[PDB]
Amino acid sequence: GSHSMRYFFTSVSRPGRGEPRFIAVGYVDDTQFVRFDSDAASQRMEPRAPWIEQEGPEYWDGETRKVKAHSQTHRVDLGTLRGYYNQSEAGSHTVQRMYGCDVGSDWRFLRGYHQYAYDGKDYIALKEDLRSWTAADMAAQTTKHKWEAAHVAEQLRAYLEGTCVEWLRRYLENGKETLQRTDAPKTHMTHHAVSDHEATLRCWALSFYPAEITLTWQRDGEDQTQDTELVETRPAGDGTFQKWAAVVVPSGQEQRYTCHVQHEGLPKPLTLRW
Amino acid sequence: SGVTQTPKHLITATGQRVTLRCSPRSGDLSVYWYQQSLDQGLQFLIQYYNGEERAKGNILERFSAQQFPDLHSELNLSSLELGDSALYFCASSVELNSYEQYFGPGTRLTVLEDLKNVFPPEVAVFEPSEAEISHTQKATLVCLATGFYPDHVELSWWVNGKEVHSGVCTDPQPLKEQPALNDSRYALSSRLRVSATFWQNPRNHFRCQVQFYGLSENDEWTQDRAKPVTQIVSAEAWGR
Amino acid sequence: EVEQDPGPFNVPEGATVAFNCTYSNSASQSFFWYRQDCRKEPKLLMSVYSSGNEDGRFTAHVNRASQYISLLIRDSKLSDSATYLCVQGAAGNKLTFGGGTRVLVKPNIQNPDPAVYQLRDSKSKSVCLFTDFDSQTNVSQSKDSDVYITDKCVLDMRSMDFKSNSAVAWSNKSDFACANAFNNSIIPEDTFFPS
């Protein structure tokens, strides 16, 4: 299996009400392992997975100082972008930032990310060659010329191709009992009359990890798109995931339809029929 | 302009206060103070960003700093001790959180127990030996600076009114004229070497110049001698 | 958290010199080499953010596994003599400096002509000038007080393509003489003592 580490940062201004709200979360794959909340009591990077708690105080002290510096830089960013867009000093605005790395099944570097959004719009993004930038409008072009002149991409690449994958591999080993696990979907099919001549078949996948999954409907062996619906994969809240797919079928024809679930935890794709 | 700092040199007594000033690079909003001592090397004191204190190293209570609306900074040191003798470096950066910190030239501070023993240098130039010219077709002048204290001196050679750097070597450190005594005065030597024919041209003029940093004119002087103020002391020789 | 080798590394002119600096926190990921000339300010030489960096005759390399940083200087020039500071960045905003590595590049004295000469005051006093010796000669301080001897010093006539070592001795004693000034140093046996 391939793997990823992602850090997500949200900074939301609140003029007159103190410094911006800053929330940072860190993920390996679909497992959250750290968070920071500028408004929480601890004022520390906090563990969110069992395998990260084995890191000593040096690790937590250092991540706390870094994440607090992150918050202060993104607080300056809110001020800067306000000027770029000639926006009023009064309103609330949102800076989002994401960075991280993917590795392949050999745990060697696959790709890296470093990108920003302002008020939900793309702002600036490191391109896949990790050497160039996509600026979404004319304020972001200002950032891009500055970052080109400061050779920012070169320093990001040192992290994305190096440090980021080295620590990702550390977490994959230290957390192997949960990060390298696959929980196979528990599956079942429900059925509901929907009109006087139609019924909804719902194919359920429960309790699976990781979140990647494929649920398909077939009629007489042929994949079916007409009258089907996919719900967004959702968290159960215990570290596994849930998802369903439904199709509306003529009543009396339930048995020509099959649901098909593929998931890394399944040695062979499952086939369910009403 | 780059990072500038004033004054370049401060000689003071224990218990006094001083103010160090820094003007950051034009366009820089962060200013940092660093202290370089013999016993702990370069140590970070304090950082301001756009007028606000933002990060603090192991700065003492009797140290205090400020960044003003024009973004220059002031470092004030009070109840001075011997141990505060150090090189104090200002640095600036464009951004709040940056490793790209550009250092100023430093202010050297020496805190003495009293100023009883501050002394300007005596400077003397020594002409080449006939033995060396006839043996090497080269001619070495030696400049001695003796009996100064503390060791805030800058020696330079000047030929025909123009400062020279080719063919000169100055000792990197002063030597103690009396190593057994603390507060001993210092000596410093420099050589300048030229071709025998260049020394032999009587139209060439050679001057050894020692800029000494000492007391300011607004410093109290109780002793029974001339006041060891910041001054230049020189010695000269013509070619022959 | 930054430990480097103090030196002084004595490097023959044109040779290659390399030294290490080690860091304690494995989460550290930003390092630099700074150069500082005596009593002047530290100046960035080269950054190192990844496994390594090569800038010209200089080459730096971060052994993230070994947790040490190296610098290498190829074809050493006399102008490379300086202190090299190992520098770690932390948290995005703080620089931590090592104590520094001193390197002294020694000149390659092609035609050593070791001699001890008598120089006289321009305005009336004298001084002994030990000069033109190979860079392997060590000049010692004298045991006797009232006898001052400086360290060896390298000067460089650029226009004459000539470099030379010298040291200076002087005293106010009547019994002081250039023939005896450097008797506490191992000096070349063929040193020229002109009467």
């Binding site: 830089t73 770029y84 920012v152 990001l156 440090t163 | - | 932390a90 995005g92």
Partner: peptide
């Protein structure tokens, strides 16, 4: 592990 190096927009 967070990236330490920070650059302002």
């Amino acid at each position: 592990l967070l990236l330490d190096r920070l650059n302002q927009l």
